[PDB]
Design a protein around this motif. Structure first.
Motif, PDB file in Angstrom:
ATOM      1  N   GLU A 159      -8.000  -3.341  -6.821  1.00  0.00           N
ATOM      2  CA  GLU A 159      -6.600  -3.707  -6.911  1.00  0.00           C
ATOM      3  C   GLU A 159      -6.079  -3.606  -8.338  1.00  0.00           C
ATOM      4  N   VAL A 163      -4.035  -9.690  -9.798  1.00  0.00           N
ATOM      5  CA  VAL A 163      -5.190  -8.816  -9.594  1.00  0.00           C
ATOM      6  C   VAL A 163      -6.333  -9.146 -10.565  1.00  0.00           C
ATOM      7  N   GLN A 195      -5.383   0.119  -8.643  1.00  0.00           N
ATOM      8  CA  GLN A 195      -4.187   0.483  -7.895  1.00  0.00           C
ATOM      9  C   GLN A 195      -2.959   0.073  -8.677  1.00  0.00           C
TER      10      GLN A 195
END
Ligand SMILES: [Cl-]
Ligand SMILES: [Cl-]
Ligand SMILES: [Cl-]
Ligand SMILES: [Cl-]
Ligand SMILES: [Cl-]
Ligand SMILES: [Cl-]
Ligand SMILES: [Cl-]
Ligand SMILES: [Cl-]
Ligand SMILES: [Cl-]
Ligand SMILES: [Cl-]
Ligand SMILES: [Cl-]
Ligand SMILES: [Cl-]
Ligand SMILES: [Cl-]
Ligand SMILES: [Cl-]
Ligand SMILES: [Cl-]
Ligand SMILES: [Cl-]
Ligand SMILES: [Cl-]
Ligand SMILES: [Cl-]
Ligand SMILES: [Cl-]
Ligand SMILES: [Cl-]
Ligand SMILES: [Cl-]
Ligand SMILES: [Cl-]
Ligand SMILES: [Cl-]
Ligand SMILES: [Cl-]
Ligand SMILES: [Cl-]
Ligand SMILES: [Cl-]
Ligand SMILES: [Cl-]
Ligand SMILES: [Cl-]
Ligand SMILES: [Cl-]
Ligand SMILES: [Cl-]
Ligand SMILES: [Cl-]
Ligand SMILES: [Cl-]
Lengths: 411, 412, 410, 411
Positions: A97, A91, A100
């Protein structure tokens, strides 16, 4: 009336409306719940996302082999420029991302500070390997820090904030624990004296010749010569002129070539900034730039001795009981009788201290005379700082994490 | 855990603030309204959506001004600088920061009409609805169609229900109304207070106060020797034409009224505001007085020797005085023929004659005592059904309930 | 920073944080720029995405043959349950792909209202085929619409908002044009009187026997037998009992079986709620349920006559100049002398009205006699409503689109 | 339709309104502050950040009161009820709605210290900065290091610089201070006014007004036959201990001073506010008078026969009187040895003797006239370099410039 939620909403609205790049960050802060956490997700980042390296690398590689069914996420400043073995997905920092990944992961594994705008829930486990046995004073132990934008106290307030999120903090030696416990405001419970995972090869592979031979031929080294490694710490002083043309290393390469060119090749591990200012024409097959090489531990394994000054690598390399020289040309400028170090630097280190590079060269001529003349001191150093590395450190963390996440797959 | 309802308000408020919307004050209000903002001794009053200082809330207020001065009184208006309130009360403008404060802080809301649904009535606050009259025409849940623009019948009723569910007490004039309110307003009988209207207290307490009758009579520059007819027709959609610049002279034929009665009688015309300022009473001075803009309708009742209306709820309030009433229902044919869109049988049990034309009406008004005698029966009957409840103590009952309500709040 | 964008911008923060399913939409509303339009993308949807069928199906099938190199997108409620021939990729309603497709497309082709939250930009061409010659008053022309949740003026306001976006509207006849110009608030400039693409096959394939045979044996029909099709419109009245067991059809299958069972087979095309309530045990090989069949035009082709009542399909089936019957059993209910129809129902339709089944059966016995008895009326009908269908409608559209997107490629 | 900067304020104000932040009065002021708000005849005074009614602002205001009674005069205070202002002026409390109206509306600001960076100085306004005296300690830009809590040296300087950029006029007591201001405050000589300080007007005009010298002396209950010595030590962090309950009696040795100087002198002690409320002057009544809380320090000078101090900017004010000064620098060694953290040459060109012990100071204090003569040579040098630029008209100059400015603005 939830007053912290209100602030994050305002902040987030401000970010969306102004097109700020941190819109991704404020959204994460708003919506981050204990419930996003999925217990079989693990994030790794090393050195603020610059490499795929160090203890987090070795912890991660061990786990790829014995626990391949967990979700693995690596975090990178630039993922496309970093190759990662195994199932791990990468990422980019500050991307959606990224957030997340950290919101979701049940375990964070890092070797340096991770950002305070990231939320370490009561639900997640942050394991800090850190990055070497200290020499210079750090964190809480520091006296002043005229670091722009931030005062000493606010710099320490922040550091302390970050260390409280550390659930486990790896340690290499009693000396370090004594230090961490104070410098990092640590509870000894949380400390794990098990040695650095990045130092597993220094024990498990110190004799694997097939392996030493891939490392050597991946660097194109002469077959007939011994290997001297030189890893000076970064110095502010020696930067001048945009950094276009530096004054040849203090260590005098012309001289080292004349002295040692027949028996030795020298690997130079400089700070990236010195690395792309160095002109090594005339020195091919003798001076090998090696600053931009992923795994420093591999460099140790193939090194017959190590020249440094005020670096933590001296403890890492001590595991191998090989000779070390400390070329400390600027020792005078460093506070004369400086206790700005945790240890007595003038006394109990594994080798000779040189302020000039010419007696260093002569000494280097015959390596074995050093090895006997300092075996007393080397073993002593080994006993204080290295007598704890088993080569099982990656295993220990790996197993802890696995064990940790079985617990979370029940209640 | 994320508070989603709060979040939504924060967005709604940010929207209003940034877009320079007038309703920013409303959303700020919605966002912050705490149950802890309520001060037990603060009380808001509004009548008819903030148009007036009048009606039952006026008379509740005036009573509490006398026996309970140390409380905080707020009155709400559309235009406060254009309304005069006796007493200690302060006035707030509608939709203004002070409006929302007042409704946020008040432990008691008093009004006679629907208050908006954007105001939040907390478990912390008591909302007293006096409403505004014994119904003749079907209202709320009891209507069959409401082709009112932008809105369907179900949704108009869904909103009316949302409102009445916030009514902590509802005032009722009589059993007849309680029956209806229980249905039309989806009300629990527990919540109905059958005590009459505070605005009809003067109709009981003061019908014989000759000095008071006289202020009212002189405030209106009424000639002395002259008896008083009040005419109050309901509004009719049909009759609006020409931007409302020149109306066709009133059906009741003023020219005829003046010829037949201009010597003994004066007639007060309480019209709808739109007719009132289109009327031309040139040539009827000292006989036809416009009284549309008069602030207290009950005062007009007290000096009225009889009432002429048609399909209004006032016939119920004026009925307390036991005086004669006439129903000039010229357009009764148009109103559905044999219509039960009225709660009562309009064709039988009202206190007076129905007149489809105004000429027989005037001959009748000639002799007022004959009318009284002729109908006394039907009058006493109307009185017994719809007005046998007013003690003239309605204003008192409510103020003492508020006072009692907030005492028990202030101790605990 | 523009106010219209701040408004959309906030709605989407709402959807993203609250996890509303409409986040796909608010995102689409935000980034929907006039530059997203790829001049060679075309979206098709029919009856609001329930089918691959009708006039859009045929405009599509024609373009597949002569313009294979375009991006064809079909939009559906449930794409995995629709089978589309050709190069088209399919999307789900309300998905990211749905909004992409509609944002990117230079041409929308459909036969029903497509939703107002979709932005038809100046850039795109919305072709409306609609779905049949009207018999019931629609849109502006309806008097009242007591439809739940909405008021009559607001309902027409929204319909008006939709029609103002139709760049082209198809028309089957002069009578329809006249009604569209009023019912849909349309300019005649925008109407193409060319006939329904869905009707192409009725003109071009009606004598194709190999094709009629596929359609027949796919339905597993007897061979010596002639075919009646029955298509009654839906009636609110007749829904009862959660819909578990209905009362047998007023047409009386038993009687029809007794009377025609040896000469005819009869195809029942019912509303989908009646279809799964019908028990047809006792009539196998006589009464076939054909309510789920995807292509109604083919059913017409293999039909020797049509029984209907109040449907726009009579106009379609009229192209074939075959006999029709109108089993108006509840015709008294329907407003007595109702002019809530555009045409004079009591008069000029192509066949007899029956209010009872039994005279209808006697009549069906001998079709040929019916054809004779009514040839005059069938022709007048064909003249008034069906004499516009070249058989070339699918071509005209596909070519219009082709011509339209050759310009944009400069 | 909405501009970005107004959006950011708009959001900050929402935050303060909803969250009941005291600062709401501020955010509103930031949103509503228009250039039209300004009323040409409104003038705001604040001195030492509102702690006082005093110094150059008081005197500029007292002049402008006598000669221009028609203007709107506003004084700003931390606690307006604890201050007495002679004349027509209305007072406002810092950070209240009135405070911000006052600064929004005013055509001219007058201060003797820094006014807050959150107040907007419109292009519409004239901010006149008197400052507070000839420096001896390096200030602002010229400081080398400032390890002051919550802020860094470069950040501290950026903020100081933001603030001086707003000064339209800066008063100056001498060329020495001009040379300095130009650098330390990042000034442009165009903006510097060398008129001497307003507060130092009575040092010139009233050095002889015997009815006025007498009111001061009887306001203070001072003995009739006794002369006056004033002592004004600067504050020293070092000497603070024990919550500050009981201090160690002053180094100057009051007991001695009494024995030696009592029969001829009385000593005014002007100490820091924190020492004042710790001093037990019991047994010294009518000899040592606590004078720390007196509002007008210039009056204190007028009546002083001499001044004892150490490292203060007040030697330069007192110098105007051409009277003797002593410098009791007991802690001179601690202060950097040969310190150049001063602008002047402290060891050489001050108008009196340096004493590190108080006993010689006292024996010397015995015969004023002997010192006045032994030092006249230096008192006169001092007075030429630092004190020769005072007209007695500084308040008038300033007052008249304001008036002149606000006749134009009246067109
Ligand atoms: Cl999981
Ligand atoms: Cl596993
Ligand atoms: Cl990248
Ligand atoms: Cl370290
Ligand atoms: Cl901070
Ligand atoms: Cl390294
Ligand atoms: Cl919120
Ligand atoms: Cl209270
Ligand atoms: Cl009271
Ligand atoms: Cl007003
Ligand atoms: Cl008033
Ligand atoms: Cl009513
Ligand atoms: Cl009239
Ligand atoms: Cl009225
Ligand atoms: Cl705009
Ligand atoms: Cl939406
Ligand atoms: Cl394209
Ligand atoms: Cl093509
Ligand atoms: Cl699907
Ligand atoms: Cl539709
Ligand atoms: Cl649109
Ligand atoms: Cl249709
Ligand atoms: Cl609708
Ligand atoms: Cl026609
Ligand atoms: Cl059946
Ligand atoms: Cl901007
Ligand atoms: Cl603020
Ligand atoms: Cl002014
Ligand atoms: Cl105060
Ligand atoms: Cl500024
Ligand atoms: Cl200074
Ligand atoms: Cl000088």
């Amino acid at each position: 009336f939830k007053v912290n939620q209100f602030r994050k909403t305002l902040r987030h609205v401000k970010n969306i409306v102004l097109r700020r790049k941190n819109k991704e960050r404020s959204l994460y802060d708003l919506t981050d719940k204990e419930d996003n956490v999925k217990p079989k997700t693990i994030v790794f980042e090393s050195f603020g996302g610059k490499n795929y390296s160090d203890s987090p690398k070795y912890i991660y590689e061990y786990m790829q082999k014995y626990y391949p069914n967990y979700r693995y996420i690596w975090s990178f400043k630039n993922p496309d420029k970093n190759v990662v073995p195994g199932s791990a997905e990468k990422v980019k920092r500050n991307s959606a991302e990224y957030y997340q990944a950290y919101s979701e992961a049940s375990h964070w594994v890092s070797n340096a500070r991770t950002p305070l705008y990231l939320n370490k829930k009561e639900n997640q486990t942050y394991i800090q390997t850190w990055n070497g046995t200290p020499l210079k004073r750090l964190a809480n132990d520091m006296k002043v820090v005229r670091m722009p934008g931030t005062t000493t106290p606010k710099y320490k307030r922040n550091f302390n904030r970050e260390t409280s999120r550390w659930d486990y903090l790896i340690s290499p030696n009693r000396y370090s624990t004594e230090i961490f416990r104070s410098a990092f405001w640590m509870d000894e419970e949380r400390i794990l004296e098990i040695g650095y995972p990045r130092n597993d090869v220094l024990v498990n592979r110190a004799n694997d010749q097939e392996y030493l031979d891939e490392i050597r031929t991946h660097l194109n080294l002469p077959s007939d010569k011994k290997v001297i490694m030189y890893a000076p710490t970064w110095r502010d002083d020696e930067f001048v002129s945009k950094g276009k043309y530096l004054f040849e290393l203090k260590i005098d390469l012309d001289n080292l070539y004349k002295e040692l060119g027949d028996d030795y090749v020298i690997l130079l591990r400089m700070h990236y900034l010195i690395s792309n200012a160095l002109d090594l024409s005339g020195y091919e097959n003798f001076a090998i730039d090696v600053s931009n090489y992923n795994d420093v531990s591999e460099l140790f394994l193939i090194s017959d001795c190590l020249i440094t000054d005020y670096s933590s690598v001296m403890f890492d390399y001590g595991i191998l009981k090989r000779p070390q020289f400390f070329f400390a040309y600027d020792i005078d400028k460093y506070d004369k009788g400086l206790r700005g170090f945790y240890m007595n630097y003038m006394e109990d280190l594994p080798g000779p201290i040189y302020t000039e590079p010419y007696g260093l060269a002569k000494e280097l001529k015959n390596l074995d005379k050093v090895q006997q003349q300092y075996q007393e001191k080397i073993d002593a150093f080994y006993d204080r700082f290295c007598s704890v590395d088993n080569g099982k450190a990656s295993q220990y963390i790996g197993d802890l994490i696995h064990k940790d996440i079985k617990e979370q797959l029940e209640h």
